[PDB]
Design brief:
This protein starts with 11 loop residues before the first strand and ends in a 9-residue tail after the last helix. The chain has one domain (12-62). It has a 3-stranded antiparallel beta sheet. Helix content is 15%, strand content 11%. The radius of gyration is 13 Å and the shape is elongated. It contains 1 helix and 3 strands, in the order E-E-E-H. By secondary structure, it is α+β, with helices and mostly antiparallel strands. Bound molecules: zinc ion (2 copies). A zinc finger (MYND-type) spans 30-66. This is Protein CBFA2T3. Zn(2+) 1 binds at residues 30, 33, 50, 54. Belongs to the CBFA2T family.
């Protein structure tokens, strides 16, 4: 029973921007379930999430999207 080296999904933060855009502009769906997304990945902030349970399920497929800054 050791932590070893395992990558876990980070919690989704609540996005709030007004300077650029007024709601989303580009895309507006949850990567996991696709039903109205209003939060972002606290890590890369690239993927869209609506809940913690959604992020975990999609986390397997997020492994290649996280840690890639913006390219
Ligand atoms: Zn969702
Ligand atoms: Zn991420």
């Amino acid at each position: 029973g050791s932590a070893s080296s395992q990558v876990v999904m980070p919690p989704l933060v609540r996005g709030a921007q007004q300077k650029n855009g007024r709601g989303s502009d580009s895309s507006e769906s949850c990567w996991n379930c696709g039903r109205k997304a209003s939060e972002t990945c606290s890590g890369c902030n690239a993927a869209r999430y609506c809940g913690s349970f959604c992020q975990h399920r999609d986390w397997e497929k997020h492994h290649h999207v996280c840690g890639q800054s913006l390219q």
